[PDB]
């Protein structure tokens, strides 16, 4: 909502670098992950067991509707966490 965005911003800067998402991107993606009912809180990102219903949906709306405005953010925020929960 304001802090979590920074907790993941500094994280993706070590697992992605300059390619990492911005503060304005994640912030927008979050609001969408809360409106779609896919998430109840911004801390839900700490649940690697919910990335399934959150990855298929985003990839479903993008492939269908024809827009991955939120996917580009999810994939990035995920590519980092996925590595943080592997070590
Ligand atoms: O310090 P970090 O961990 O590198 O995170 C950056 C920080 O939040 C900056 O204030 C922000 O500039 P804005 O508040 O103007 O968005 C930038 O977005 P940006 O890369 O699009 O400039 C973020 O990436």
Shape: globular
Order of helices and strands: HHHH
Determine the structural class based on helices, strands and strand pairing: mainly alpha
Distance between the termini: 27 Å
Largest sheet: none
PDB class: viral protein
Keywords: RSV, Gag, IP3
Assembly: monomeric
Entry title: HADDOCK structure of the Rous sarcoma virus matrix protein (M-domain) in complex with inositol 1,4,5-trisphosphate
Itemize the secondary structure elements and their pairings.
Elements: H1 4-15, H2 23-35, H3 51-65, H4 71-84
Helix pairs in contact: 1-4, 3-4
Bound molecules: D-MYO-inositol-1,4,5-triphosphate.
D-MYO-inositol-1,4,5-triphosphate (I3P) binds next to helix 1 and helix 2.
What's this model, at a glance?
It comes from Rous sarcoma virus subgroup C (strain Prague) (RSV-Pr-C). This protein is mainly α. 62% of the residues lie in helices and 0% in strands.
């Amino acid at each position: 909502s304001e802090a979590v965005i920074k907790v993941i911003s500094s994280a993706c800067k070590t697992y992605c670098g300059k390619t990492s998402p911005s503060k304005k991107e994640i912030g927008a993606m979050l609001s969408l992950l809360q409106k779609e009912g896919l998430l109840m809180s911004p801390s839900d990102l700490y649940s690697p067991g919910s990335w399934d219903p959150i990855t298929a949906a985003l990839s479903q709306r993008a492939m269908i509707l024809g827009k991955s405005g939120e996917l580009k953010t999810w994939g990035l925020v995920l590519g980092a966490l996925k590595a943080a929960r592997e070590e």
